[PDB]
Amino acid sequence: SSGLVPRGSHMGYSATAPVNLTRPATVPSMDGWTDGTGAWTLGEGTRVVSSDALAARAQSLASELTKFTDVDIKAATGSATGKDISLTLDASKKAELGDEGFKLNIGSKGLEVIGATDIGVFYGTRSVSQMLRQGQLTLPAGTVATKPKYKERGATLCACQINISTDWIDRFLSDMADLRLNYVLLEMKLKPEEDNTKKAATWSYYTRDDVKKFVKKANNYGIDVIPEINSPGHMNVWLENYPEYQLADNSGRKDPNKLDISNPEAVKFYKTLIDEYDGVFTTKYWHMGADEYMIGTSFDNYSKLKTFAEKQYGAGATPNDAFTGFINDIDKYVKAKGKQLRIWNDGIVNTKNVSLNKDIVIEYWYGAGRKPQELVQDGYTLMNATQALYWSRSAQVYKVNAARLYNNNWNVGTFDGGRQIDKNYDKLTGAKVSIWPDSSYFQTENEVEKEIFDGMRFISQMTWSDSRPWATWNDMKADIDKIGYPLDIREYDYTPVDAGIYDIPQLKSISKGPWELITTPDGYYQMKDTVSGKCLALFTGSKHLDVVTQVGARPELRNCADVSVGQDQRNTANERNTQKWQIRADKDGKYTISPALTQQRLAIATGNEQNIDLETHRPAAGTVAQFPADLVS
Numbered sequence: 324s325s326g327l328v329p330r331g332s333h334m335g336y337s338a339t340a341p342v343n344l345t346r347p348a349t350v351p352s353m354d355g356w357t358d359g360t361g362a363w364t365l366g367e368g369t370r371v372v373s374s375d376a377l378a379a380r381a382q383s384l385a386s387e388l389t390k391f392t393d394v395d396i397k398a399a400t401g402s403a404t405g406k407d408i409s410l411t412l413d414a415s416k417k418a419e420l421g422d423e424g425f426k427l428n429i430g431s432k433g434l435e436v437i438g439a440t441d442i443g444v445f446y447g448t449r450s451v452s453q454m455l456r457q458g459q460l461t462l463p464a465g466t467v468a469t470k471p472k473y474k475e476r477g478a479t480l481c482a483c484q485i486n487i488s489t490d491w492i493d494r495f496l497s498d499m500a501d502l503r504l505n506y507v508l509l510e511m512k513l514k515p516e517e518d519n520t521k522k523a524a525t526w527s528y529y530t531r532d533d534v535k536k537f538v539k540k541a542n543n544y545g546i547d548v549i550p551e552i553n554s555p556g557h558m559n560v561w562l563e564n565y566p567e568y569q570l571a572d573n574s575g576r577k578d579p580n581k582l583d584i585s586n587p588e589a590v591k592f593y594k595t596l597i598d599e600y601d602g603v604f605t606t607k608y609w610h611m612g613a614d615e616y617m618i619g620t621s622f623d624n625y626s627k628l629k630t631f632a633e634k635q636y637g638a639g640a641t642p643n644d645a646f647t648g649f650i651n652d653i654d655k656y657v658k659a660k661g662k663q664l665r666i667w668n669d670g671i672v673n674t675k676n677v678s679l680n681k682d683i684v685i686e687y688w689y690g691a692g693r694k695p696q697e698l699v700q701d702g703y704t705l706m707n708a709t710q711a712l713y714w715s716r717s718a719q720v721y722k723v724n725a726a727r728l729y730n731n732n733w734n735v736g737t738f739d740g741g742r743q744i745d746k747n748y749d750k751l752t753g754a755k756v757s758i759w760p761d762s763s764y765f766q767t768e769n770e771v772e773k774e775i776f777d778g779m780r781f782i783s784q785m786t787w788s789d790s791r792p793w794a795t796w797n798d799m800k801a802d803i804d805k806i807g808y809p810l811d812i813r814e815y816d817y818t819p820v821d822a823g824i825y826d827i828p829q830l831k832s833i834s835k836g837p838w839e840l841i842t843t844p845d846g847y848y849q850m851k852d853t854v855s856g857k858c859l860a861l862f863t864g865s866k867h868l869d870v871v872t873q874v875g876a877r878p879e880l881r882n883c884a885d886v887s888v889g890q891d892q893r894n895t896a897n898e899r900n901t902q903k904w905q906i907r908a909d910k911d912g913k914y915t916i917s918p919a920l921t922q923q924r925l926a927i928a929t930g931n932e933q934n935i936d937l938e939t940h941r942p943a944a945g946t947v948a949q950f951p952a953d954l955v956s
């Protein structure tokens with residue numbers, strides 16, 4: 324026989340190691356590794372040692388490593404040995420490491436992680452976690468220092484019109500942290516609570532408490548959460564119940580998507596929203612959008628803006644000058660709150676009397692506008708938000724093809740439409756992927772999470788390392804799958820109850836039950852009524868993005884859809900995904916049921932829930948309906 328047996332190296336440092344022992348991969352890659360003699364093995368007795376100041380980082384890494392390796396790893400202070408992982412914060416290494424970089428030294432003193440900042444050390448621990456969670460506990464000796472090429476690296480997450488659950492956002496932030504991504508532009512509605520704005524508290528919204536919680540999580544992971552309230556276009560979710568602030572065209576027809584920037588009360592309403600957000604986001608930026616204001620039409624249909632332009636900005640001013648002056652007035656407003664403004668590049672229009680302020684960050688997505696090289700020449704600060712890095716749940720033109728970009732030599736300088744600029748442009752901030760819902764019933768959020776996996780690793784590698792150390796994309800793919808997700812994602816209880824037969828008293832207005840629960844591949848349940856043989860759906864009500872957003876909408880029984888199929892079954896998507904339910908166990912043991920697509924929660928209506936939608940239609944008191952969790956907790 325072969326006598327095949329586990330090697331079982333002693334823990335700690337060994338001066339002997341085979342010359343070609345695998346060095347487990349990381350993403351981003353840590354390029355320019357210098358080999359040393361020997362190897363280091365995590366094993367019984369290994370500790371994570373640090374200063375008192377780094378204790379929280381060390382305790383967290385020790386609990387994480389205990390879970391991935393099956394070895395009891397404890398945190399400690401004081402002296403480290405060769406058996407240990409040591410964390411050091413040495414702020415004097417800013418030149419070598421900058422604000423986010425880190426050095427690993429693996430040798431007879433153990434595995435050292437050195438950062439010049441707390442986030443630097445935290446980022447080095449993410450590589451330590453990736454290297455040790457792949458089934459190999461012995462790491463080749465040597466040293467590497469690495470730091471990101473670009474300052475802003477991450478994603479637009481449009482949690483907009485539909486709601487992306489805060490559980491999903493928490494996972495997403497853990498994934499970003501694992502990939503050293505430090506930027507999320509979150510276009511979302513924070514629930515408006517004051518007098519001139521409260522009628523815009525329609526769903527989706529997030530409460531102040533819930534935003535404070537995930538911004539706190541993001542900040543501990545080194546992530547800047549930048550809010551966007553898109554304006555003066557794409558304002559439907561804000562202006563639906565404020566027709567007094569909507570722009571009317573030349574025939575008097577108002578569009579709930581368009582802010583009337585010639586109405587000072589409408590401008591004040593937008594500023595009031597910025598003040599509301601200021602209290603919960605910690606970032607130094609404000610993103611106002613400025614995309615697609617006149618989509619589907621033209622300023623020729625809005626003569627009122629030309630009249631406004633001439634009064635406000637002088638004879639010969641044009642609607643593009645009024646539009647630009649609104650952006651510059653918002654810039655003035657947020658600078659006075661200590662923030663810097665950011666817009667999408669199609670907000671850059673041909674002006675005459677007004678010039679757009681050059682202290683505004685330009686997030687470039689639309690290469691039909693003024694071209695990337697012209698903006699370089701103009702001296703704007705630019706972020707690459709190319710359409711090549713888009714996903715949409717419905718627009719199949721937008722699905723990121725990481726293999727193609729890896730193989731075609733895309734880099735952060737490759738702006739929309741393959742238009743290359745100098746990747747070393749001193750005002751190129753970095754690059755991001757963009758996650759857009761559009762018609763939202765084609766894909767559940769959990770399917771979005773499965774689909775974006777590879778593209779998130781792609782953008783992490785190209786904005787930190789800007790290198791292709793894997794010979795082809797397929798070589799990269801194999802390693803990013805071996806690295807896998809961070810612990811928080813692996814521990815999330817997608818489906819906390821077993822499939823089988825349940826009594827569900829909250830659903831007695833629909834059927835006396837019992838109900839058969841079965842799980843789906845994307846972590847939800849179908850609920851079949853054993854009385855009618857039909858399945859519970861949240862199907863009917865007023866919608867945004869083709870998903871029911873109506874507060875107080877009631878679920879109904881419909882013939883059972885096939886919930887076992889994937890997102891490529893687009894022709895049955897809506898019947899299928901309206902029959903998916905997410906079950907969560909609270910703190911603790913009690914269960915709440917949410918429609919997978921709407922992320923509101925079922926509850927028995929009392930008649931006391933307070934929300935603008937309910938001013939005009941309430942579900943019959945005592946029946947089961949969906950409501951935002953804040954109205955029912």
Ligand SMILES: CC1=N[C@@H]2[C@@H](O[C@@H]3O[C@H](CO)[C@H](O)[C@H](O)[C@H]3O)[C@H](O)[C@@H](CO)O[C@@H]2S1
Pocket residue numbers: 481483484510553557612614615667688713715718721759760761762
């Ligand atoms: C910027 C870009 N604008 C469109 C983007 O529009 C966004 O649509 C969402 C709903 O999906 C929100 O309404 C935003 O306010 C609006 O900016 C699209 O979603 C995107 C992908 O189809 O394409 C451009 S990029």
